[PDB]
Each structure stands twice: as C-alpha cells, then as structure tokens.
Amino acid sequence: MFQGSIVALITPFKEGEVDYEALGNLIEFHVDNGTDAILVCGTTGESPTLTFEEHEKVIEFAVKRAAGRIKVIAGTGGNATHEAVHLTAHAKEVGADGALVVVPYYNKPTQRGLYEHFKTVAQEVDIPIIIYNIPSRTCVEISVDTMFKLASECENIVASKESTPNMDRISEIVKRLGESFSVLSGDDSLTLPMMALGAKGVISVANNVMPREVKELIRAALEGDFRRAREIHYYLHDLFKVLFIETNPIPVKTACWMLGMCEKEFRLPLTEMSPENENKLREVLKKYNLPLKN
Amino acid sequence: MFQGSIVALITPFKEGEVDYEALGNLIEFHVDNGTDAILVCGTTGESPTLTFEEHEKVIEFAVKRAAGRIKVIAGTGGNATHEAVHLTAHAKEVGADGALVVVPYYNKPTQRGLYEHFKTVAQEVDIPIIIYNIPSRTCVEISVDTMFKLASECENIVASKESTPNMDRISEIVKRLGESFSVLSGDDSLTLPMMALGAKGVISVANNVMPREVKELIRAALEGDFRRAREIHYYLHDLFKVLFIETNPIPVKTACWMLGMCEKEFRLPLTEMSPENENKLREVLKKYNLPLKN
Amino acid sequence: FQGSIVALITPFKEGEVDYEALGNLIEFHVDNGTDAILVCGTTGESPTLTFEEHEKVIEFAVKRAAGRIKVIAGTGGNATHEAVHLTAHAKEVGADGALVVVPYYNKPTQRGLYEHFKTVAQEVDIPIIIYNIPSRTCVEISVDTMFKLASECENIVASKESTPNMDRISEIVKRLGESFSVLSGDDSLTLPMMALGAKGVISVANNVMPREVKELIRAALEGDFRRAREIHYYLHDLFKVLFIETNPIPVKTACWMLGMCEKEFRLPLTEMSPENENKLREVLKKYNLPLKN
Amino acid sequence: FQGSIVALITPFKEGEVDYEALGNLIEFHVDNGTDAILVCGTTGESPTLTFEEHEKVIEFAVKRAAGRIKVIAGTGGNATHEAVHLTAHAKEVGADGALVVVPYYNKPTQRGLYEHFKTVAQEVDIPIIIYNIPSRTCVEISVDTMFKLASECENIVASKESTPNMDRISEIVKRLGESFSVLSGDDSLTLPMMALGAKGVISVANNVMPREVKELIRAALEGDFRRAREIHYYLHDLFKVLFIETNPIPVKTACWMLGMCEKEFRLPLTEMSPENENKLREVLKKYNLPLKN
Incomplete structure (x- = not known):
C-alpha cells in the first residue's frame, strides 16, 4: 500500500524552534500538488538535531494537519531499540499511517542485532513499518x-x-x-531503474520542490511507459544532481528557502551552502523556471 | 547500430591450444539461436592468456566461419597503445564488424592518457569502436x-x-x-535497468548458455514491455548469479562444457571451479532443464 | 593525553547501569596502572545510554576515581547543541577531558565539522579529544x-x-x-602509529589485559620497538578476537567471562553467536586468563 | 632481499629503450649506496615494453651492474606460461631475483593464484618476490x-x-x-611497516634521492625510529608529490628534470598536467635538488 510519490519533508526552523506555520503550508503544498504521502522527521527532516519531543510534536502536528488527505509516515527510528519502540508507539498513538525505521547507524549491530531490533519494534507496535536502508550513512547494511x-x-x-x-x-x-512487500527508491536518480525492476515508488528529496513533475515520473513508471519515464527522468536529472551538491538536506532546504517556503535556517552540525554552490543551485532552479521568492 | 543480444564468447581450449572445432560449433550455436553478434577475445574469451597470434587467428576464424551470417566484434585492446593499434588494424583487415577496446588495465593512465589511447586507436583504424569500461578489473575508470x-x-x-x-x-x-552513441550493458543482471534508462542491448556472459532466453529479454526491453522483461529477468536471475559464483569466465566455460560445447580446459592463472561450486552450478542448470552432455 | 587509556565498557544489570560493577572496573584500572579511563565511548555503549545515564556515568567515574586516575568523558553526538550541554556537564563534574566524536549519520560538510567542534570548544573550557572513526560515522574530518x-x-x-x-x-x-596528540584508536595499529609519533592508545584490549597493553605503550614511548614488536605479536590473537563481532560485543563478553560484569547488552547489540563466543573463550584461555564464567 | 631497493624507471629515446641513460642510472645507484635495482617493474613501464625489451633490459642490467649491486627482474604478468618463460630467462642471464606480480585484470581465484606462483617457482630455481598491489591488479593474494x-x-x-x-x-x-621477508611497496609506509618487522623497501623515491632513502632504511634497521621519523617527515613532501599522478609519471618526470632521461613515456602513459608538473618542480626545488631541465 505504500507506493507512489512520497516526499521526505524538510523540517522548517525559525528562531531556533520548529516553524509550524511553514510546516503547515508545506503540508498543504503537497496536498494540492499530487504527492501521495509525506514522511516527517526523516533524515531530510533533520531528525538528528530534533529533540525527542519535537519529533512527537511534529508527527502529531502533521497527522492533524494532513487529516487523511494524504498519508503521513513518521520517522521513528534511531540506533537504540528501546527508544525506537517508544517513538514508534507514539506515532501509532497519534494516528500516523506508517513508521519509517532506519537501520541502526554508528553502532553497527550484527544481523542478529538488526533482526531483534526491527522484530522488537514491529511486535510492540501494530503499525505498518518501512525499513530504511542507507549504508552510506548508517555504515552498516541489513x-x-x-x-x-x-x-x-x-x-x-x-x-x-x-x-x-x-x-x-x-x-x-x-x-x-x-x-506483498514493497520496495521504495531512496534516491531520486534511481527511481526509474528501480521501478523498472519492480519498485513501487520513491521516498523523494526532489519532491520538496517539484512535486508535480516527480509525481508524473512515478505515474509513467507505474503505467509501464518508460519512454515517458525517461523523458521526465532526463528532464529532471539536473535537479536530482544539484540537490546533492552538498550533504542532503542542505541543498533541498536551501531550495525551499529560495522558493519562500521556509527560513534559511539549519541546526548545527548542518550549515548553509558555500556561496559558490548556493549560486549553482539558484541557477539550476532558474533553468527549470521555478518562481523564486528569495 | 551495435545493439541487441551480443555474446561475450568463451575461447575453447584442447590439448593446450585453441579448439577450433569447438569454436566453430559455438558460432553455429549462436547463428541458429538468434544472437545478434559474437564478441571474440574479450575477458570472457580469456584474452589475457591468448598470445597476440592466437588473437589474430581467433578473430579471422570467427569472421570467415561466420561467413556474414552474424556480426563479429573483436576484442583488440590491452594496456599498451601501440599493440592495441596493431591488433585493431588486424581486426579491420580481416573484416571484423567492430572492435571492443578495453580501458587500459593495471597501469592506471590519467584521463588524458585514456583520451590519447582511444583517440590514437580510432584515428589509425577506420573500424567502429566500442569502449569497454570495467573498473572492477582494470582498476581505473574512463x-x-x-x-x-x-x-x-x-x-x-x-x-x-x-x-x-x-x-x-x-x-x-x-x-x-x-x-548516436550506444550504451551496452556489461552485466547480465543489470541489463533490464540499464535498458530502462536507454541502453541498447547487452554484451552478455549468460547468452553463452541461454541465447534464446536472453535475446527474449532484450527484445521485450527494446519494445518497452518491461512487464515481460521483468518476467524473463527474474526467471533468469538464478542463472545470472551462478555464472559469477567464481571469477568469470570460470563458471560460464564450465557451463558450456556441461552442455557439451567445449572441453573443461582453462589456461593458468585461471583454474577449474572447486568441486563444490561446480556441483552447485550443475544444480542450477538442471533447474533450467538444460540438455547437459557432461 | 598519552599512554594506555581504556575505552571502558558500561556494565548493565537487569536493564540499568551496574554501578557496583563499574566501581570495581575503576579500581581494576587503578590497580593495573592504566593511565586514564574513558567512559561513555562507543565501547561503553554510548548509543543506547540515555542523556541522563551519560551524565550520571561521567560523574560517578570522576567521583569514584577521586583523582587516583584521569577520567575522560565521551560527550559527543551528531547534534551540536546536545554535545555542548553534555560537554559542559563533564567540565562541571570535573572530568579531565572530553572525547567528542565526529558527527555520525548526518554527514556534515567540513565547514559543519569545523563549526561543530569550534562551538563545543569555545563554550566549554575543557581539554577536547576529537574522535575520528569513518567506518562508524560514515564521514571523516x-x-x-x-x-x-x-x-x-x-x-x-x-x-x-x-x-x-x-x-x-x-x-x-x-x-x-x-604539542597536539594523536592517540591510536585501534589496538592492532598502536605500534605502527606510535612509530610514526602517536602518543598512546585509547584501547579496547585494555579492558581485559591492562598490564600487557601498558607494557606495549611503554616500550614504544621508550623507542624500544624490538620489545614493542614482541608484545604486539604476543597480543595479536587477543587484538583480532576482540573484533570477531562488532565492538564492544566481544570485549564485554570477555569481561563477563572474567567475572567483571553481567552478560548484558542493550539492543541493537546482542550476545555473540555461540561459535564466536567459543572462539573468544579459547583465545582467552590461551593467555591463561583467570576466567570465572 | 632487504634494505633500499629502487623500482627503476625505464628511459626511452626516439621510441626505443635508452640504454645509455639506463647504464648511467645503474652507475648512479652503485655510486649512491642503493642495495638492489628492480628493472622492468611497474615503475619501469613493464606494461608497454615488449617481451623482447624485457629480455634485453634484464640482460643489459645484470651485465652492467656486474654484481656491484643486486639486480631484480620484473618477470610477471597475468599469464602463467609467459611468466615462467620470462622468469626462466632472468635466471639464465644472471638476475639475482625475480619479482612476480599477482596477476592483474583476470582476477584468478586463490587456487589459481597458488598454482600461478607455484608453477613459476618450481620451474625456475631463482629467488622469487611476490608483488601484491590490489589497487592495480584488482585482486589480492x-x-x-x-x-x-x-x-x-x-x-x-x-x-x-x-x-x-x-x-x-x-x-x-x-x-x-x-626467513620470509616483507618489503614495503610504498615509500610513505616504509617506516610503519619496518617498525612492524618489514626488512626494507622497493622504492620509487630513491630514483631521485637514493642517499636519503637509504638513511631512512638504515635508521629503521637499527631500531632508531627517532631518526627514522626525522628522515620520514623530511622526505614526506617528496613521497607525496611523486604520486600526484599515476606512478611512474611523476618520478620519470623528476628524473628528466634531474637530467637523467628524456621526457618520454609510452602511451597510455603521458606527460603530467602542466600545473602538476610545476608543483613537482617546486617540491624538488625545496629539496635543493640539481635540476638540469
């Protein structure tokens, strides 16, 4: 059931606090642009720097705002099982449609450890769970x-x-x-080839700024029309690459700021882009004729 | 122009010499099974252990025996530009339809060196050239x-x-x-996703064993029917994997031997498979109900 | 910071930190000559310790140590604000230094790493040791x-x-x-790193054979690599077995066999596979260690 | 095999091996204390030399050195039959040893690796040195x-x-x-490898600074790593720049700047990027080397 165009939503900040009015508008943005689901508190949402309480507040807030118009998936994992269980329980409690649980990063558990981790969370909370595998960040693979x-x-x-x-x-x-299992692309540039192999959608970063186009790429693939998929894929290629000129979500949050969707504010260790890179990003967005507010 | 199902043909040996009787039968095998082109003296053909002379002989043998019934591509590269020019000129002279020139292995030239290597070969010999990039073997990438x-x-x-x-x-x-440029998959298990992105075919290891099925996969992809491509891909997955249980072409040549197409003979440093792996290979081929003679 | 420093494990007992075991661990190192004790490091299962347990373990180590042994507090994470707070607490309770790991998982840009450490350093006047381990953090300073x-x-x-x-x-x-000090982060590489100029090691092996490791360090610091090699190759088997499974799984299991702590980890960490635990036992018995379990 | 061994470049002139230049290189090393010369290695551009030139160069070297310095012949490739014959030739013409690289490109299984070296070793009674360099061969023994x-x-x-x-x-x-001897195959790692028991280095750097490298090896062999460190760090900039581009592009260029050979490579190897060649010149000047070109 988890399929289509899913956006790994950034978490707007203002005055050093979560910017709820911006988050709310971000949610409406996706509701009227065809996005199938929103993932809040994920890597792109800067979960590493969000307090445990901000995590629960953002999830609870997203569920209330979306209110069934679009699915809401909550990032509830970390590298501590007990903690992941509690946060996943919360997501269940406040009405989230699913929980994204990342493979434990940094402590590199054994495969048995990974099994017990996900098993423990799954058996504890009756909510659909999506495993999140990203070896390039976790430094381990399930x-x-x-x-x-x-x-x-x-x-x-x-x-x-x-x-x-x-x-x-x-x-x-x-x-x-x-x-009965669903594979979702965790990288925009790989959505097309992964869907050609059977993936059912993507949890995208590019979705944050060009929801409609990404959605179109996904529908073409779901329809089996890869001639059209390739057309959209290659058109969006420049965007897919520039969003990673610096560690995600630095570029994507910066792009949203340029579109006036949020304040240009990150939480350390994340920082603003280098002027050179930020200008490269602006130039790419302009080639796509995006209405930049900043 | 170079597209479809192309086989990276093994080079059969007998009594420490190239087995031309077996090589001839291999050519017939691909002519009546619909293979689009035969590549001789590639990595799968054990070019590393073939003398310059045997290279010249295998190429002319392939072109003449093919007698225009199937395209013939000659593996003519190495890590020395002068000899690559010489062998490529030979392929041209004996009527090869094209030359596959590998990215120089071991000496790791700079990008300028790779540019000059390929430019020199291409300008000296008026024959269509296919660049062969395989970083896992050459230890450098163009x-x-x-x-x-x-x-x-x-x-x-x-x-x-x-x-x-x-x-x-x-x-x-x-x-x-x-x-006007053609990308050919150099990995059987990656043909489906690469063609979904626009690749025009594959220079395959697996079609040495199942040319009809592989061509069917290519045909579906070219027609844009990825539903059918996926069915063939997943059907052939076990075959694609077992053919790399040991360094290629050890398993594929062993598979050809089991099918009665060549002697179970390699040139050192290559060796026969371990008894255990060989038995595992046989089990997979039986699963595909292949007519084993050995 | 130099010499033989131990990346101490964090003993657990029925779901909580085992302070009696931790206390014995501290005296264990005071009695064996260890130069410093690093608490709440990766080896100490920092990832599964709450923030409160971190500050608690840090203060407990400092107060129970009572100046008898240097204490280093693991206070880093991948969120700058939190690192500042925990480092401030280490300073507050009297730790001799703070080990701050390069942010893991969020892969900050070099500028981000600069600002991360600069912020912590400028906010807390305590000696700071940068901890670089790309194989775990998936980024390198x-x-x-x-x-x-x-x-x-x-x-x-x-x-x-x-x-x-x-x-x-x-x-x-x-x-x-x-003046800057490079400390080896891998027991197996201590000898070559010190030959290059490293000042010591923050070891895992130190948890079970403190005297032998200290001996390796002394020989290296004295410039006697003939002797350092002798100790290095003697402990080679120990060094390798301690990483047969992700650290600290092997070392904590070893401490358990030595009767230094309960055999308890916090998920996602788990007990070793029975066959690997058998391997560990055989190696330990080869060094004629007095196993109690 | 031990001490300071040079992976000698192979001078070219007008598309042919420059024997006059090669002879002078051999005298250069006899005069500067180098322990042995390795001819037709990776650094000597063996990939682009014909089987014939291999034979010619090896025979020339032995005859010129005439026992004043040991001569090691690079005789391996990724074809066993070929390696046996070239190694047989090396023994025939009087080489003191043969360096046989782990087969590159065809990625033999460990069994194939075993049979490869065993076949060569049993067929030719000459001391054999295995050359393991995964970054080039794309496989490891x-x-x-x-x-x-x-x-x-x-x-x-x-x-x-x-x-x-x-x-x-x-x-x-x-x-x-x-009895077995490990030789460093990387100048920047000679110190740590020797601290661990390696017996010397087959170096690229001693093509241009034979005396300094020899001193580094001697200090290490004596167990004086304080002295080894000052030489290591003194030569670090050189060790580094000699690999700013794929070896032997930088070292042969350096030799040319020193007037030891013509500025000529065999494709696919090419001259350095202009900016890099200038960086190399700066480094050599910092060492006050007598540049002729």
Missing part, C-alpha cells in the same frame, strides 16, 4: 536474508526504503520477499 | 568527460560496454553523449 | 579542518584516530603542533 | 595462500607489499617464517 526473515515473521513489516546504488540488491529483494 | 570528448572527436567511437553497477553513470552517458 | 580547529582552539589538543591510513597519521603529526 | 606458497616453495622468499593495511603486514610477519 542483509536480504535478514529482511526476508523479518518480513516473514512480522506481517507488520511491509516495505523498505532503499538508498543503495546496487540494482542487484533490489532484484534480490523483489524476487525473494515477494509481492 | 570519465564521462573523457568519453564525451572521444565520441565528439572520433566518428568511429560509437559505443561503450559498461560493466558498472552505477546507474547514474549510465544516465550521465545517455544524456551527455548523442542519440 | 579532514586534516585541513583539524589544523584549523587546533590552531584556533587552544583546548582542542588531541585526536583518537580509528583509521587504517598511516599516511593520515603522518599528515596530522607533520601538520599539527608537536 | 591472501595471507593463507602466501603461507602455503612460502611453505611449499623454498624459493618464494619475500613479498613487496603495496597495501595501506598494516594489519596484513602484521599477519604476514607473524604467520610466515623468520
């Missing part, structure tokens, strides 16, 4: 064997956001976990 | 910038065999180089 | 950034390097002051 | 395979290790005999 064991034991574990350049891994997951 | 410059300056540098797991590189090549 | 940081912040005085790149060690030693 | 080879063939006596993994060096030193 094996397909482990994913298979997890999806088989917990009807609760239904999908995986894959931020991996290995198409072979996607093939393995699609083939082994079967049709 | 940048897209270098490829763009070469393709722009040399009319006969028309394609690239890409054995890379980076779909983004494929996107970059398709987008930056003309519609 | 550049030597250019370290140079700039050490040049501007007088209290940024050292770096724990868990890197297999000896060239990076050479660049740091060469570019940063003679 | 495991310590297990090395152990099996060294145990089986008395003439497989050493390994040139171009790896940044000190743990691999420790493993080789500990597992293989005291």
Whole structure:
C-alpha cells in the first residue's frame, strides 16, 4: 500500500524552534500538488538535531494537519531499540499511517542485532513499518536474508526504503520477499531503474520542490511507459544532481528557502551552502523556471 | 547500430591450444539461436592468456566461419597503445564488424592518457569502436568527460560496454553523449535497468548458455514491455548469479562444457571451479532443464 | 593525553547501569596502572545510554576515581547543541577531558565539522579529544579542518584516530603542533602509529589485559620497538578476537567471562553467536586468563 | 632481499629503450649506496615494453651492474606460461631475483593464484618476490595462500607489499617464517611497516634521492625510529608529490628534470598536467635538488 510519490519533508526552523506555520503550508503544498504521502522527521527532516519531543510534536502536528488527505509516515527510528519502540508507539498513538525505521547507524549491530531490533519494534507496535536502508550513512547494511526473515515473521513489516546504488540488491529483494512487500527508491536518480525492476515508488528529496513533475515520473513508471519515464527522468536529472551538491538536506532546504517556503535556517552540525554552490543551485532552479521568492 | 543480444564468447581450449572445432560449433550455436553478434577475445574469451597470434587467428576464424551470417566484434585492446593499434588494424583487415577496446588495465593512465589511447586507436583504424569500461578489473575508470570528448572527436567511437553497477553513470552517458552513441550493458543482471534508462542491448556472459532466453529479454526491453522483461529477468536471475559464483569466465566455460560445447580446459592463472561450486552450478542448470552432455 | 587509556565498557544489570560493577572496573584500572579511563565511548555503549545515564556515568567515574586516575568523558553526538550541554556537564563534574566524536549519520560538510567542534570548544573550557572513526560515522574530518580547529582552539589538543591510513597519521603529526596528540584508536595499529609519533592508545584490549597493553605503550614511548614488536605479536590473537563481532560485543563478553560484569547488552547489540563466543573463550584461555564464567 | 631497493624507471629515446641513460642510472645507484635495482617493474613501464625489451633490459642490467649491486627482474604478468618463460630467462642471464606480480585484470581465484606462483617457482630455481598491489591488479593474494606458497616453495622468499593495511603486514610477519621477508611497496609506509618487522623497501623515491632513502632504511634497521621519523617527515613532501599522478609519471618526470632521461613515456602513459608538473618542480626545488631541465 505504500507506493507512489512520497516526499521526505524538510523540517522548517525559525528562531531556533520548529516553524509550524511553514510546516503547515508545506503540508498543504503537497496536498494540492499530487504527492501521495509525506514522511516527517526523516533524515531530510533533520531528525538528528530534533529533540525527542519535537519529533512527537511534529508527527502529531502533521497527522492533524494532513487529516487523511494524504498519508503521513513518521520517522521513528534511531540506533537504540528501546527508544525506537517508544517513538514508534507514539506515532501509532497519534494516528500516523506508517513508521519509517532506519537501520541502526554508528553502532553497527550484527544481523542478529538488526533482526531483534526491527522484530522488537514491529511486535510492540501494530503499525505498518518501512525499513530504511542507507549504508552510506548508517555504515552498516541489513542483509536480504535478514529482511526476508523479518518480513516473514512480522506481517507488520511491509516495505523498505532503499538508498543503495546496487540494482542487484533490489532484484534480490523483489524476487525473494515477494509481492506483498514493497520496495521504495531512496534516491531520486534511481527511481526509474528501480521501478523498472519492480519498485513501487520513491521516498523523494526532489519532491520538496517539484512535486508535480516527480509525481508524473512515478505515474509513467507505474503505467509501464518508460519512454515517458525517461523523458521526465532526463528532464529532471539536473535537479536530482544539484540537490546533492552538498550533504542532503542542505541543498533541498536551501531550495525551499529560495522558493519562500521556509527560513534559511539549519541546526548545527548542518550549515548553509558555500556561496559558490548556493549560486549553482539558484541557477539550476532558474533553468527549470521555478518562481523564486528569495 | 551495435545493439541487441551480443555474446561475450568463451575461447575453447584442447590439448593446450585453441579448439577450433569447438569454436566453430559455438558460432553455429549462436547463428541458429538468434544472437545478434559474437564478441571474440574479450575477458570472457580469456584474452589475457591468448598470445597476440592466437588473437589474430581467433578473430579471422570467427569472421570467415561466420561467413556474414552474424556480426563479429573483436576484442583488440590491452594496456599498451601501440599493440592495441596493431591488433585493431588486424581486426579491420580481416573484416571484423567492430572492435571492443578495453580501458587500459593495471597501469592506471590519467584521463588524458585514456583520451590519447582511444583517440590514437580510432584515428589509425577506420573500424567502429566500442569502449569497454570495467573498473572492477582494470582498476581505473574512463570519465564521462573523457568519453564525451572521444565520441565528439572520433566518428568511429560509437559505443561503450559498461560493466558498472552505477546507474547514474549510465544516465550521465545517455544524456551527455548523442542519440548516436550506444550504451551496452556489461552485466547480465543489470541489463533490464540499464535498458530502462536507454541502453541498447547487452554484451552478455549468460547468452553463452541461454541465447534464446536472453535475446527474449532484450527484445521485450527494446519494445518497452518491461512487464515481460521483468518476467524473463527474474526467471533468469538464478542463472545470472551462478555464472559469477567464481571469477568469470570460470563458471560460464564450465557451463558450456556441461552442455557439451567445449572441453573443461582453462589456461593458468585461471583454474577449474572447486568441486563444490561446480556441483552447485550443475544444480542450477538442471533447474533450467538444460540438455547437459557432461 | 598519552599512554594506555581504556575505552571502558558500561556494565548493565537487569536493564540499568551496574554501578557496583563499574566501581570495581575503576579500581581494576587503578590497580593495573592504566593511565586514564574513558567512559561513555562507543565501547561503553554510548548509543543506547540515555542523556541522563551519560551524565550520571561521567560523574560517578570522576567521583569514584577521586583523582587516583584521569577520567575522560565521551560527550559527543551528531547534534551540536546536545554535545555542548553534555560537554559542559563533564567540565562541571570535573572530568579531565572530553572525547567528542565526529558527527555520525548526518554527514556534515567540513565547514559543519569545523563549526561543530569550534562551538563545543569555545563554550566549554575543557581539554577536547576529537574522535575520528569513518567506518562508524560514515564521514571523516579532514586534516585541513583539524589544523584549523587546533590552531584556533587552544583546548582542542588531541585526536583518537580509528583509521587504517598511516599516511593520515603522518599528515596530522607533520601538520599539527608537536604539542597536539594523536592517540591510536585501534589496538592492532598502536605500534605502527606510535612509530610514526602517536602518543598512546585509547584501547579496547585494555579492558581485559591492562598490564600487557601498558607494557606495549611503554616500550614504544621508550623507542624500544624490538620489545614493542614482541608484545604486539604476543597480543595479536587477543587484538583480532576482540573484533570477531562488532565492538564492544566481544570485549564485554570477555569481561563477563572474567567475572567483571553481567552478560548484558542493550539492543541493537546482542550476545555473540555461540561459535564466536567459543572462539573468544579459547583465545582467552590461551593467555591463561583467570576466567570465572 | 632487504634494505633500499629502487623500482627503476625505464628511459626511452626516439621510441626505443635508452640504454645509455639506463647504464648511467645503474652507475648512479652503485655510486649512491642503493642495495638492489628492480628493472622492468611497474615503475619501469613493464606494461608497454615488449617481451623482447624485457629480455634485453634484464640482460643489459645484470651485465652492467656486474654484481656491484643486486639486480631484480620484473618477470610477471597475468599469464602463467609467459611468466615462467620470462622468469626462466632472468635466471639464465644472471638476475639475482625475480619479482612476480599477482596477476592483474583476470582476477584468478586463490587456487589459481597458488598454482600461478607455484608453477613459476618450481620451474625456475631463482629467488622469487611476490608483488601484491590490489589497487592495480584488482585482486589480492591472501595471507593463507602466501603461507602455503612460502611453505611449499623454498624459493618464494619475500613479498613487496603495496597495501595501506598494516594489519596484513602484521599477519604476514607473524604467520610466515623468520626467513620470509616483507618489503614495503610504498615509500610513505616504509617506516610503519619496518617498525612492524618489514626488512626494507622497493622504492620509487630513491630514483631521485637514493642517499636519503637509504638513511631512512638504515635508521629503521637499527631500531632508531627517532631518526627514522626525522628522515620520514623530511622526505614526506617528496613521497607525496611523486604520486600526484599515476606512478611512474611523476618520478620519470623528476628524473628528466634531474637530467637523467628524456621526457618520454609510452602511451597510455603521458606527460603530467602542466600545473602538476610545476608543483613537482617546486617540491624538488625545496629539496635543493640539481635540476638540469
């Protein structure tokens, strides 16, 4: 059921606090632009620097604002199982449609550890769970064997956001976990090839600024029209690349600021772009004829 | 122009010499199974252990025996420019339809060195040239910038065999180089996603064993029917994987032996598979109900 | 900061920090000559300790140590504001230094890393040790950034390097002051790093064979690498087995066998596979360690 | 095999091997204390030399050196039959040893790696040095395979290790005999590898500063790492710049600047990017070297 165009929403900041009015407008932005679901408090949403309480407040707020018009997925994981259980329980409590649980970063648990982590959370909270695999950030990877064991034991574990350049891994997951499981692209530039292999959508960064176009790419792929998919993919390629000229979400939050959707404010260790890179970004957005407010 | 199902043909040996009887039968095998072109003396053909002379002989043998019934591409590269020019000139003289020139391995030339290497070969020999990029073996990669410059300056540098797991590189090549350039998959398990991005075919290891099925996969992709492409892809997945249980071409040549197409003979440093892996290979081939003779 | 420093494990007992075990651990190192105790590091399962447990463990280590042994507090994370607060607390309770890991997971730009450490350093007047371990953080603080940081912040005085790149060690030693201190972040690399100029090690092996490791350090610091090699190769098997599974799984299991703590981890960490635990036991018995479990 | 060994460049002139220049290079090393010369190695552009030139260069070197300095012949490739014949030729013409690289590009299995070296070693009674450089060959010979080879063939006596993994060096030193010799395959890692037990280096840097490198090796062999460190750090800038571009592009260019050979490579190798060549010149000037070009 998790499919289509999903946006990894940035978390607006103002006066060093979560900017709820901007977040609210961001939600409306996606409701009227065709986005299928919003992921709040994810990596792109700067969850590392959000307090545990801001996490629960943002999730609760998003659910209330969206109010069923679009799905709301909450980023509820970390590298501590007990903590992930509590936050996932909260998401369940406040009405979130699903929980995105990242593979534990930094402490590099064994595969048995990864199994017990996800199993513990899934058996504790009756909410759809999406595994989030991104080795380039977590410095560890959940094996397909482990994913298979997890999806088989917990009807609760239904999908995986894959931020991996290995198409072979996607093939393995699609083939082994079967049709009731859903693979979601964790990288905009790889959505087309991943969907050609059976992925059901993408949890996108580019979605933050060009919702309609990304949505179109997804529908073309879902329809099996890859001639049209390629057309959109190559048109959006420049955007996909520039959004990563610096560590995500630095570029995407900066782009949203340029479009007047939020304040140009991050929380350390994240910082504003280098003037040179920020100008490259502005120039790319202009080529797409986006209405820049700042 | 170079597209479809192309086989990276093994080079059969017998009594420590090239087995021309077996090589001839291999050519017949591909002529009546619909293969689009035969590539001889590539990595899968054990070019590393073939003398310059055997290279020359295998290429002429392939062209003459093919007798115009199937395209013949000659593997003519190495890591020394002078000899690459010489062998490529030979391929041209004996009527090869094209030359596959690998990115120099081991000596890791600079990008300028790669530019001069390929430019020299292309300008000296008027034969269509396919660049062969495989970083996992050569330990260096020809940048897209270098490829763009070469393709722009040399009319006969028309394609690239890409054995890379980076779909983004494929996107970059398709987008930056003309519609007049052809990208060929250099990895059987990656053919589907690469063609979804615009690749025109594959220089395959698997079609040595199942040419009809692989061509069917290519046909579906070219027609844009990725639903059918996926069915073939996943059907052939076990085959694609087992053929790399040990360094290519050890398993594929062993598979050809089991099918009775060649002797189970390699040239050191290559060796026969371990008894255990060989048995695992046989099990996979039986699963595909292949007519094993050995 | 120099010598044999131990990246101490954090004992657990039925869901909570085991302070009696931790207390014995402190005396264990006071009695064996260890130069300093690092609490709440990766080896101490910092990832699964709440913020309150961090500050609690840090104060407990300082107060129970009572100046008998130097205490270093692991106070970093990937959020600058939190790191400042925890580092301030370490300073507040009297820790001798603060180990601040390079932000993990969010991969800050070098400018971000600069501002991260600068902020903590300028806010808390306590000696700071940068902790670089790319294999876990998935990002690396550049030597250019370290140079700039050490040049501007007088209290940024050292770096724990868990890197297999000896060239990076050479660049740091060469570019940063003679005063700056490079501490090995990998037991297996202590000898080569010290031959290059490193001042010591923040070890994992220290948790079970404090005297032998201290011996390795002394020989290296004395310039007697003939002897350092003798100790290095003798402890080689120990060094390797301690990483048969993700650290601190092996070392805590070893401490348990030695009767130094309960066999309890916090998920996602788990007990070793029975076959790897058997391997660990065999190695320990080979060093004739008095196992109690 | 030990001490300071030079991976000699191969001078070219008008598309042919420049024997006059080569002879002078040999005298240069006899005059400056180099322990052995390796001809037709990666640094000597073996990839672009014909089998014929390989034979010619090796025979020329032995005849010129005439025992005043040891001569090691690069005789390997990724084809076993070919390596046997070239190695046989090296022994025939009087080479003191043969360096056989781990097969590149075709990625043999460990069994193939075993058979490759075993076949060469059993066919030719000449001391053999294994050359492991994963960054170029794209495969690595495991310590297990090395152990099996060294145990089986008395003439497989050493390994040139171009790896940044000190743990691999420790493993080789500990597992293989005291007789087996590990030689650094990277100038910047000679110090740490020797601190671990390596016996010398097959260097690129001593092509231009033979005396200084020799002193580094001597200090290390004597166990005086304080002195080894000052030389290591003194030569760091040189070690670094010699790899600003793929070796041997920088070192051959340096030799040309020193007037030791013509500025000529064989494609696919090319002259340095202009900006990089200028950076190289600056570094050599900093060392006050007598530049002729």
